[PDB]
Amino acid sequence: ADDIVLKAKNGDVKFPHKAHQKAVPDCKKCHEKGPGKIEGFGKEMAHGKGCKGCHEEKKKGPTKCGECHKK
Numbered sequence: 253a254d255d256i257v258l259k260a261k262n263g264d265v266k267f268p269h270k271a272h273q274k275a276v277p278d279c280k281k282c283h284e285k286g287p288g289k290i291e292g293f294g295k296e297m298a299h300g301k302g303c304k305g306c307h308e309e310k311k312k313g314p315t316k317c318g319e320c321h322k323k
């Protein structure tokens with residue numbers, strides 16, 4: 253499958269799966285979550301444990317606006 257881009261108005265956000273599979277070998281961090289996770293994702297989650305928050309806890313991955321958002 254292909255990577256996806258989240259169409260944030262302030263700038264596209266790329267989600268590179270290969271890097272995540274490698275850096276987060278514990279797949280259950282994202283997969284086999286209960287229902288609601290597709291509907292649930294948004295800016296709140298992204299800026300929280302959905303994206304940025306994991307980067308902060310693991311001490312790797314983009315945490316600055318322009319590192320995720322790019323026109």
Ligand code: HEC
Binds near residue numbers: 269
């Ligand atoms: C969240 C940060 C994830 C982690 C950790 C893992 N995966 Fe993932 N996966 C995630 C998304 C959002 C998607 C769909 C969008 C995309 O970029 O592909 C996927 C997709 C997969 C797939 C399909 C891949 C393909 O056919 O190219 C597989 C087989 C898959 N994910 C498995 C997988 C495994 C085995 C992981 C741990 C080792 C793993 N993923 C981590 C989100 C996230």
Ligand code: HEC
Binds near residue numbers: 271275302303320
């Ligand atoms: C842990 C549970 C994570 C979640 C959820 C998300 N990301 Fe992540 N990401 C994580 C780590 C530990 C790393 C470092 C990978 C590396 O090899 O450097 C990353 C990396 C990224 C990157 C950069 C990829 C690269 O080639 O260096 C991007 C662009 C990125 N992450 C974006 C991103 C987004 C948009 C997420 C939510 C939709 C997201 N990540 C979730 C750990 C985790």
Ligand code: HEC
Binds near residue numbers: 293
């Ligand atoms: C990656 C880890 C991110 C960082 C760091 C920042 N943002 Fe973000 N933001 C991210 C994603 C994946 C999304 C989309 C959520 C979704 O619904 O798919 C967003 C969203 C926004 C928005 C809203 C955009 C819209 O609704 O169209 C804004 C205004 C925004 N982000 C701004 C922003 C700023 C100023 C940041 C630094 C302070 C920042 N983001 C960090 C991913 C990530």
Ligand SMILES: C[C@H](CCC(=O)O)[C@H]1CC[C@H]2[C@@H]3CC[C@@H]4C[C@H](O)CC[C@]4(C)[C@H]3C[C@H](O)[C@]12C
Binds near residue numbers: 281282290
């Ligand atoms: C569930 C995990 C981990 C975050 C958490 O614990 O909630 C999160 C991390 C990345 C999230 C995905 C980001 C890309 C997509 C954004 C869409 O708007 C909703 C579906 C997708 C596919 C999201 C589904 C789910 O919300 C995921 C896989």
